[model samples]
Target chain A: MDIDNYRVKPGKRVKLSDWATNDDAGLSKEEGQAQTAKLAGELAEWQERLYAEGKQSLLLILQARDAAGKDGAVKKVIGAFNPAGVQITSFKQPSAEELSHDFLWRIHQKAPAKGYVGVFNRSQYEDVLVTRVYDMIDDKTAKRRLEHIRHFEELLTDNATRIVKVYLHISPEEQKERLQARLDNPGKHWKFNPGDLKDRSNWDKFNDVYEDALTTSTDDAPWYVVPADRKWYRDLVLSHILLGALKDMNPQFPAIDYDPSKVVIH
Target chain B: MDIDNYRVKPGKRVKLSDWATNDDAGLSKEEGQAQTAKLAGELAEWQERLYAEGKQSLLLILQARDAAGKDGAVKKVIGAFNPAGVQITSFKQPSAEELSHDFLWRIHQKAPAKGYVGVFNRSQYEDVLVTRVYDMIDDKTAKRRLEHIRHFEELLTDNATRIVKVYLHISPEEQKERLQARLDNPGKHWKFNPGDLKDRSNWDKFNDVYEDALTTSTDDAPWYVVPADRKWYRDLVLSHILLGALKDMNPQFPAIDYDPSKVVIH
Candidate 1:
């Protein structure tokens, strides 16, 4: 599968509705899952090399509507990774202290350290997405924040952090079904947030802001709009994207100055 | 199979030499690994409930000498956990800014947030272990620090965070072989620290200080000395310890205030 087919070109506009929400890239469920498992093993090895290199890092920004399988992808794909080198942070409603600082201040504090893989379930883009949908921030302010985000990403890229932003694109029908399932299952009641229905009421607004924010994507920190309605296909596509990033980084285990044969343990 | 046998009782003197470094608890390697896999699944389910409940947290502190499989245990056992709810922090040498503050200050900042499981590869115990062994802190100061550690753990426990501390116990002879292997393998050269040999020379001193620290174990934050000469056995013991801890926590799916059946999703 050519992952670039899903890339949101920097200068182009995005209409998430035009993108396929359930594409499987010609692979069946069994084939996609098998390939994903193979890629997962390779990802695990590359992660170790990245850790041993201790010179670079990865920041994965995952943004999607509720019930878009963001948590599931992290579990099935990234879960193949050794927990020692992985850090996952899920952003929630900003606190009073957070609101006092510039939006990026809290995000900058959580950036992945060198030699680690950091996953952000919701990220700085939320400042633009949620705030815009809620009419909390004006369009002009949202545009400026997008520009700041591009520059902020450039800084991290220059400092050896490769950025990968994934927008899980699910159809409204799929989201509704997922939400309804949660409401119907007593055990999953905790997973259903009443506020989610409110967000559903403003779906079109969220998509518009998301497209605006994604337009600011740069080559250094590209955004991929993956079709996420099919869970298996979504995971497979993500595995491929992550493996490509790790390969591009090409992390190698550091060489030692002294010959191992000459070293004495005593 | 009884995990309590490995627990270090509070106020009791610890003698590391008395603990076996290769015990398998009468299980063959295959049996142990199979059972570990079973427990891993249960641990994952409990972890999800912990996240859904959103009240308590777990702090797992892992301590061992070099090549005692601290990293390996995290990879093999804790790797079963979803990265979304798991945070792994490996404490190295204190930074100038970290050391400028009281020792616990840096540690306090990294404590697990609510509804998360936090793993510390090496932790506050290092303050008492390494400093005491190197005589950087006098005996009186070491004792005072241990007292402070007990109180620190008590504070976290009272705040609804459960603590599990494990010391991967390895024989000096086994450590020598592992260190030798690292020196012999060129690919693993980066993993071998020249200073590890220095630490090896002070193995007896480390054991003494470790015993001193383990003696401070309390009911709220108990310590387990698991045999680490056999990597499989070490992983199995740790799985049981963690599973027991989670069962004790008994996290349940939370009941929602509103009737889910009455909710409509847009």
Candidate 2:
């Protein structure tokens, strides 16, 4: 399937316009659903092997515009796994204590331990994403933070953590429709953030900042833009990428040195 | 059904010897399973209401003996809810950074935000559990920590985080049986904690300390002694306790006067 082709080129200047917002590799919604179901079981089996092997990990970083189906992908794709083998973290606003540390501090702490697949619903990328758009950080600081992110992920990979960064690509029209649905649906009203409205107004700036941020890391940690307009494709594509990465890790059950017959329960 | 009788009374002496480790509310295993199925649906609905309301949070603090089924209760009792509505945290050995702060400091940070159900698999209570047995602090310090825990939980309740604490009570004989099964099964070897063996040797000490820990906090965050020797009953009782607590909170989806007929989705 050549999922790696989806990875952003390291030194390339990224224009968000280059990516499709609803790519499905020419599959229909029904085909995408079937593929996701099959890949999901395979992913679970690989996750168990990863846990049994207890030597390496996979960190999936998800970045997306509002209503980009981040939750949809997460719940359908990785949601069914045993929580012991997965840690799902969504970094909201930083508090006084978290703000006291370096930008990568809280993130480093949430990094998955051996044998676990950590999913970042939103991550340290926010340091660049929202911070850059809102000018909470200076231009120089932004550049320095990008370097820090690059090195930080390198450190993670050096320690046997495979990092896959995913950006849920969605068109502005898709976002507007979804945000409007939130207003119309009483059930989704709680998710309405006045800030989302304010943030939506800065869509152009976010797109530019996201493209620049994705260019920060390469190879061992590269960003894949997952088209999210058709959520079926979003889920199927993410599942395929996940399975491909874990199969690359080649996680296996721990080998026992002693004869099982010799070691008795009693 | 009055699980309040399970709550350890503050200022009253706790005798682990007096509690039943296999109590099942006199239900057959089959009946317990059926009851759990019903409660699961109710819980999911109430949780949806909780998320919709976005006002109060529920924190379930689970303390248990090794193999007392903390993970079991989590997966079976509260695991079915949307991850968006639940935050499960298990505190392991403290890190250098964690130790740098007051015992309650790290715990307070993980407290569930409004509209989430936070489950602490093992929590700040550990400070007084293992820390007390290993003599990390003097008796005075242990007592002081208990006082601090009570007050901290009080602060959470004052801030709309309704707390329910359950201690998964198990007999030493039952624990030994579960631990031996782990050793006997090749697949369970990873879970066979070498420390569990040593911790088992200090069984009497843990039991006594757990008693003391429970006696420290009552009422707002009462510690219910859930008999966990029988896995089925353990899940059932824990589910009932959790459902009871949340129903007491009585979360409701926010009411909107704008008629669905009046407002249309474009």
Clashing pairs in 2: none
C-alpha DockQ for predicted model 2? 0.19
> Residues B139-238, candidate 1, lDDT per residue (tens digit)?
9999999889989999999999999999999988899899888887767878987788888889899988999989868888999999999998999999
Q: What digit string (tens of lDDT, one per residue) describes model 2 on residues B18-75?
A: 8888887778999989999888889887887887788999998988878989988876
After superposition, the stretches of candidate 2 with alpha carbons farther than 4 Å from their true spots are A1-5, A9-19, A23-55, A84-116, A124-148, A193-208, A251-266, B1-20, B23-55, B84-87, B93-109, B127-145, B202-205, B252-266
Decoy 2 TM-score against native: 0.79
Going through the candidates in order, the fraction of native interface contacts each one reproduces equals 0.95, 0.10
Over A199-248, each residue of candidate 2 has an lDDT whose tens digit, in order, gives 77788899888877988758789789877889898888899889889999
Q: State which candidate has the highest TM-score.
A: 1
For candidate 2, what's the RMSD? 4.5
Q: Model 1: per-residue lDDT, tens digit, A83-150? A: 88888888999999999999999899988889999899999999999888878989799889988999
